Design an enzyme around this catalytic site. Structure first.
Site, PDB file in Angstrom:
ATOM      1  N   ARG A 125       0.793  -1.226   0.000  1.00 25.67           N
ATOM      2  CA  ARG A 125       0.000   0.000   0.000  1.00 25.67           C
ATOM      3  C   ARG A 125       0.830   1.283   0.000  1.00 25.67           C
ATOM      4  O   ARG A 125       1.975   1.298   0.453  1.00 25.67           O
ATOM      5  CB  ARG A 125      -1.019  -0.023   1.144  1.00 25.67           C
ATOM      6  CG  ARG A 125      -0.422  -0.031   2.540  1.00 25.67           C
ATOM      7  CD  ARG A 125      -0.004   1.348   3.007  1.00 25.67           C
ATOM      8  NE  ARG A 125       0.285   1.344   4.436  1.00 25.67           N
ATOM      9  CZ  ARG A 125       1.034   2.246   5.059  1.00 25.67           C
ATOM     10  NH1 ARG A 125       1.636   3.205   4.371  1.00 25.67           N
ATOM     11  NH2 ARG A 125       1.225   2.153   6.367  1.00 25.67           N
ATOM     12  N   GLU A 224      -7.403   6.952   7.901  1.00 25.19           N
ATOM     13  CA  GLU A 224      -6.283   7.640   8.530  1.00 25.19           C
ATOM     14  C   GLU A 224      -5.715   8.702   7.590  1.00 25.19           C
ATOM     15  O   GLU A 224      -5.373   9.804   8.020  1.00 25.19           O
ATOM     16  CB  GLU A 224      -5.186   6.651   8.924  1.00 25.19           C
ATOM     17  CG  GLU A 224      -3.934   7.320   9.468  1.00 25.19           C
ATOM     18  CD  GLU A 224      -2.912   6.327   9.977  1.00 25.19           C
ATOM     19  OE1 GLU A 224      -1.707   6.659   9.972  1.00 25.19           O
ATOM     20  OE2 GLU A 224      -3.313   5.217  10.385  1.00 25.19           O
ATOM     21  N   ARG A 228      -5.682   5.738   0.688  1.00 22.15           N
ATOM     22  CA  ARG A 228      -4.718   4.649   0.706  1.00 22.15           C
ATOM     23  C   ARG A 228      -4.897   3.826  -0.559  1.00 22.15           C
ATOM     24  O   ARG A 228      -6.007   3.409  -0.884  1.00 22.15           O
ATOM     25  CB  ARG A 228      -4.933   3.748   1.923  1.00 22.15           C
ATOM     26  CG  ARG A 228      -4.616   4.401   3.256  1.00 22.15           C
ATOM     27  CD  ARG A 228      -3.116   4.609   3.404  1.00 22.15           C
ATOM     28  NE  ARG A 228      -2.745   5.065   4.740  1.00 22.15           N
ATOM     29  CZ  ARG A 228      -2.742   4.290   5.820  1.00 22.15           C
ATOM     30  NH1 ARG A 228      -3.080   3.011   5.723  1.00 22.15           N
ATOM     31  NH2 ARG A 228      -2.407   4.795   7.000  1.00 22.15           N
ATOM     32  N   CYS A 270       0.224  10.352   9.826  1.00 26.32           N
ATOM     33  CA  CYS A 270       1.215   9.862  10.775  1.00 26.32           C
ATOM     34  C   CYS A 270       2.617  10.011  10.177  1.00 26.32           C
ATOM     35  O   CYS A 270       2.817   9.753   8.990  1.00 26.32           O
ATOM     36  CB  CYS A 270       0.937   8.402  11.133  1.00 26.32           C
ATOM     37  SG  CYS A 270       2.128   7.668  12.274  1.00 26.32           S
ATOM     38  N   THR A 272       5.100   8.130  10.580  1.00 31.26           N
ATOM     39  CA  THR A 272       5.638   6.826  10.200  1.00 31.26           C
ATOM     40  C   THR A 272       5.380   6.516   8.728  1.00 31.26           C
ATOM     41  O   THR A 272       6.002   5.619   8.157  1.00 31.26           O
ATOM     42  CB  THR A 272       4.992   5.699  11.025  1.00 31.26           C
ATOM     43  OG1 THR A 272       3.584   5.656  10.763  1.00 31.26           O
ATOM     44  CG2 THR A 272       5.223   5.923  12.510  1.00 31.26           C
ATOM     45  N   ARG A 279       4.037   0.532   2.489  1.00 30.45           N
ATOM     46  CA  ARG A 279       4.151  -0.623   3.368  1.00 30.45           C
ATOM     47  C   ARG A 279       3.903  -1.898   2.572  1.00 30.45           C
ATOM     48  O   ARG A 279       2.770  -2.200   2.195  1.00 30.45           O
ATOM     49  CB  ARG A 279       3.178  -0.529   4.544  1.00 30.45           C
ATOM     50  CG  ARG A 279       3.460  -1.542   5.645  1.00 30.45           C
ATOM     51  CD  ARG A 279       2.612  -1.286   6.880  1.00 30.45           C
ATOM     52  NE  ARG A 279       1.314  -1.949   6.796  1.00 30.45           N
ATOM     53  CZ  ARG A 279       1.114  -3.239   7.051  1.00 30.45           C
ATOM     54  NH1 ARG A 279       2.132  -4.015   7.400  1.00 30.45           N
ATOM     55  NH2 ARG A 279      -0.109  -3.745   6.990  1.00 30.45           N
ATOM     56  N   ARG A 308       3.277  -7.454  12.593  1.00 26.75           N
ATOM     57  CA  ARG A 308       1.920  -7.117  13.003  1.00 26.75           C
ATOM     58  C   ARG A 308       1.069  -8.380  13.059  1.00 26.75           C
ATOM     59  O   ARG A 308       1.456  -9.421  12.529  1.00 26.75           O
ATOM     60  CB  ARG A 308       1.306  -6.126  12.014  1.00 26.75           C
ATOM     61  CG  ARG A 308       2.009  -4.779  11.995  1.00 26.75           C
ATOM     62  CD  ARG A 308       1.439  -3.854  10.935  1.00 26.75           C
ATOM     63  NE  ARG A 308       2.129  -2.567  10.919  1.00 26.75           N
ATOM     64  CZ  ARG A 308       1.569  -1.419  10.556  1.00 26.75           C
ATOM     65  NH1 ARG A 308       0.301  -1.387  10.171  1.00 26.75           N
ATOM     66  NH2 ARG A 308       2.278  -0.299  10.578  1.00 26.75           N
ATOM     67  N   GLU A 313      -2.073  -3.993  12.612  1.00 27.88           N
ATOM     68  CA  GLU A 313      -1.381  -3.527  13.809  1.00 27.88           C
ATOM     69  C   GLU A 313      -2.265  -3.651  15.048  1.00 27.88           C
ATOM     70  O   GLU A 313      -3.491  -3.573  14.960  1.00 27.88           O
ATOM     71  CB  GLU A 313      -0.902  -2.083  13.624  1.00 27.88           C
ATOM     72  CG  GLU A 313      -2.007  -1.098  13.271  1.00 27.88           C
ATOM     73  CD  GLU A 313      -1.547   0.347  13.334  1.00 27.88           C
ATOM     74  OE1 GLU A 313      -0.336   0.582  13.530  1.00 27.88           O
ATOM     75  OE2 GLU A 313      -2.400   1.249  13.200  1.00 27.88           O
TER      76      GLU A 313
HETATM   77  N1  LIG Z   1       0.135  -9.028   3.469  1.00 25.05           N
HETATM   78  C1  LIG Z   1      -1.208  -8.958   3.752  1.00 25.05           C
HETATM   79  N2  LIG Z   1      -2.026  -9.943   3.257  1.00 25.05           N
HETATM   80  C2  LIG Z   1      -3.358  -9.820   3.573  1.00 25.05           C
HETATM   81  N3  LIG Z   1      -3.998  -8.880   4.298  1.00 25.05           N
HETATM   82  C3  LIG Z   1      -3.146  -7.908   4.778  1.00 25.05           C
HETATM   83  C4  LIG Z   1      -1.736  -7.901   4.533  1.00 25.05           C
HETATM   84  N4  LIG Z   1      -1.130  -6.790   5.146  1.00 25.05           N
HETATM   85  C5  LIG Z   1      -2.153  -6.141   5.748  1.00 25.05           C
HETATM   86  N5  LIG Z   1      -3.403  -6.782   5.551  1.00 25.05           N
HETATM   87  C6  LIG Z   1      -4.719  -6.291   6.112  1.00 25.05           C
HETATM   88  O1  LIG Z   1      -4.844  -4.936   5.911  1.00 25.05           O
HETATM   89  C7  LIG Z   1      -5.716  -4.347   6.888  1.00 25.05           C
HETATM   90  C8  LIG Z   1      -5.074  -2.980   7.412  1.00 25.05           C
HETATM   91  O2  LIG Z   1      -4.340  -3.175   8.504  1.00 25.05           O
HETATM   92  P1  LIG Z   1      -2.866  -2.134   8.952  1.00 25.05           P
HETATM   93  O3  LIG Z   1      -2.209  -3.259   9.710  1.00 25.05           O
HETATM   94  O4  LIG Z   1      -3.677  -1.099   9.661  1.00 25.05           O
HETATM   95  O5  LIG Z   1      -2.327  -1.837   7.534  1.00 25.05           O
HETATM   96  P2  LIG Z   1      -2.065  -0.270   6.697  1.00 25.05           P
HETATM   97  O6  LIG Z   1      -0.596  -0.148   6.349  1.00 25.05           O
HETATM   98  O7  LIG Z   1      -3.010  -0.717   5.603  1.00 25.05           O
HETATM   99  O8  LIG Z   1      -2.517   0.847   7.612  1.00 25.05           O
HETATM  100  C9  LIG Z   1      -5.875  -5.410   8.008  1.00 25.05           C
HETATM  101  O9  LIG Z   1      -7.140  -5.998   8.046  1.00 25.05           O
HETATM  102  C10 LIG Z   1      -4.891  -6.550   7.619  1.00 25.05           C
HETATM  103  O10 LIG Z   1      -5.526  -7.789   7.711  1.00 25.05           O
HETATM  104  N1  LIG Z   2       0.132   5.384  11.513  1.00 17.11           N
HETATM  105  C1  LIG Z   2      -0.277   4.090  11.851  1.00 17.11           C
HETATM  106  N2  LIG Z   2      -1.373   3.653  11.264  1.00 17.11           N
HETATM  107  N3  LIG Z   2       0.518   3.398  12.784  1.00 17.11           N
HETATM  108  C2  LIG Z   2       1.723   3.966  13.390  1.00 17.11           C
HETATM  109  C3  LIG Z   2       1.630   3.995  14.922  1.00 17.11           C
HETATM  110  C4  LIG Z   2       0.401   4.822  15.324  1.00 17.11           C
HETATM  111  C5  LIG Z   2       0.457   5.359  16.776  1.00 17.11           C
HETATM  112  N4  LIG Z   2      -0.897   5.755  17.176  1.00 17.11           N
HETATM  113  C6  LIG Z   2       0.976   4.236  17.735  1.00 17.11           C
HETATM  114  O1  LIG Z   2       1.840   4.593  18.562  1.00 17.11           O
HETATM  115  O2  LIG Z   2       0.493   3.094  17.616  1.00 17.11           O
HETATM  116 MG   LIG Z   3      -3.793   1.008   9.381  1.00 19.34          MG
END
Ligand SMILES: Nc1ncnc2c1ncn2[C@@H]1O[C@H](COP(=O)(O)OP(=O)(O)O)[C@@H](O)[C@H]1O
Ligand SMILES: NC(=[NH2+])NCCC[C@@H](N)C(=O)O
Ligand SMILES: [Mg+2]
Length: 356
Positions: A125, A224, A228, A270, A272, A279, A308, A313
């Site tokens: 993403r 966020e 995205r 954010c 990050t 990512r 994660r 996360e």
């Molecule tokens: N490699 C992957 N394969 C399948 N689903 C994924 C993968 N990486 C993230 N996801 C999904 O993407 C969604 C967003 O989660 P986050 O961990 O918040 O990612 P982002 O970088 O999209 O903010 C979650 O439901 C997670 O299951």
């Molecule tokens: N930007 C994002 N989606 N994740 C980075 C960490 C977010 C921050 N609230 C934390 O300390 O978890």
């Molecule tokens: Mg996220």
């Protein structure tokens, strides 16, 4: 900055100091010296240090703990952002500037798991912010809808593989929302870190998801970040996923103006997510290495990777499935970011085979 805000800041700072086992970058880098220098500053949109740090004060389990209410905040409150950014992204000096956008040579990517025994699915993403619009905490309801309209209207022009439909979160059934989330496609609802950053006002107004019918190309609207842009599929074909993401972003960039900074690259809510905003992750099982997620994370970190849970996360692994991705997004090109995920995952797999 009114007295009421200063009191809360002084009180918030104290809480951070007292949290002996707090491990956030906010706590680590918001020193007394740093704090006094910027606590009386305010942006043109009225964002204060409280807006920046509030999420980290209330949520002591934060890894980072701060957000930018507007683009200006990154500099107005630079003395806090700068060291936190430097720490997270694995090195970024005051004099450093994020490199020009460079997807690199996609044909140099390899097969991560030909036998299909480790990798379940692959996802990459990026994020983007619309020029002229502030971040979540400064948006009005009316602003959310215009952005929703512009983005949804733009994505209706996507063609071929990328052609798809916009689904607002408003009107989406509870059953439908949960299914899209369970299937790892739609962003989750009710993130405590975002809420306390005042990033979730008017929910779900202006929020939604665009995707093609196969759900290999998706765009989150007004979560966020304003956008995205997501490519994902079952299996381990990173090359295809990355190529699809590139195609989408290049096409979208030609249509919508995104905020870009000479030093910080593409702007995000954010810190990050600055820079490449990228990512690249896999859902992967590594049973020998994973028999203690704290050990797994230690292995991953040395490869500049982040671990994660299966639902994203702040979640646990389910069925031995971890989400592993590049941690760094800023101070390296898109190609280098995606290669870090590839290279690290290739090596972790090597280690898994060699493990007892
Ligand atoms: N490699 C992957 N394969 C399948 N689903 C994924 C993968 N990486 C993230 N996801 C999904 O993407 C969604 C967003 O989660 P986050 O961990 O918040 O990612 P982002 O970088 O999209 O903010 C979650 O439901 C997670 O299951
Ligand atoms: N930007 C994002 N989606 N994740 C980075 C960490 C977010 C921050 N609230 C934390 O300390 O978890
Ligand atoms: Mg996220």
């Amino acid at each position: 900055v009114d007295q009421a805000t200063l009191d809360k800041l002084e009180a918030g700072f104290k809480k951070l100091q007292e949290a002996s086992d707090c491990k956030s970058l906010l706590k680590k880098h918001l020193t007394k010296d740093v704090f006094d220098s910027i606590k009386n500053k305010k942006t043109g949109m009225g964002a204060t240090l409280l807006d920046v740090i509030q999420s980290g004060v209330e949520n002591l389990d934060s890894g980072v703990g701060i957000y930018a209410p507007d683009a200006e905040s990154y500099r107005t409150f630079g003395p806090l952002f700068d060291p936190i950014i430097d720490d997270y992204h694995g090195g970024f000096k005051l004099t450093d500037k994020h490199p020009p956008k460079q997807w690199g040579d996609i044909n140099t990517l390899v097969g991560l798991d030909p036998a299909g025994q480790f990798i379940i699915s692959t996802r990459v993403r990026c994020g983007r912010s619309l020029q002229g619009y502030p971040f979540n905490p400064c948006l009005t309801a009316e602003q959310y809808k215009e952005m929703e309209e512009k983005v949804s209207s733009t994505l209706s022009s996507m063609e071929d593989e990328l052609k798809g439909t916009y689904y607002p979160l408003t009107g989406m059934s509870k059953a439908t929302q949960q299914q899209l989330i369970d299937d790892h496609f739609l962003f989750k609802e009710g993130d405590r870190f975002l809420q306390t950053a005042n990033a979730c006002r008017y929910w779900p107004t202006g929020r939604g998801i665009f995707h093609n019918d196969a759900k290999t190309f998706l765009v989150w609207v007004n979560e966020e970040d304003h956008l995205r842009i997501i490519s994902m599929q079952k299996g381990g074909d990173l090359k295809t996923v990355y190529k699809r993401l590139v195609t989408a972003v290049d096409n979208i960039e030609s249509k919508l103006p995104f905020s870009h900074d000479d030093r910080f690259g593409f702007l995000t809510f954010c810190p990050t997510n600055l820079g490449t905003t990228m990512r690249a992750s896999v859902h992967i099982q590594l049973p020998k290495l994973a028999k203690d997620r704290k050990v797994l994370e230690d292995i991953a970190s040395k490869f500049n990777l982040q671990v994660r849970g299966t639902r994203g996360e702040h979640t646990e692994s389910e069925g031995g499935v971890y989400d592993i991705s590049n941690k760094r997004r800023l101070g390296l090109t898109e190609y280098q970011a995606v290669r870090e995920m590839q290279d690290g995952i290739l090596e972790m797999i090597k280690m898994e085979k060699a493990a007892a």
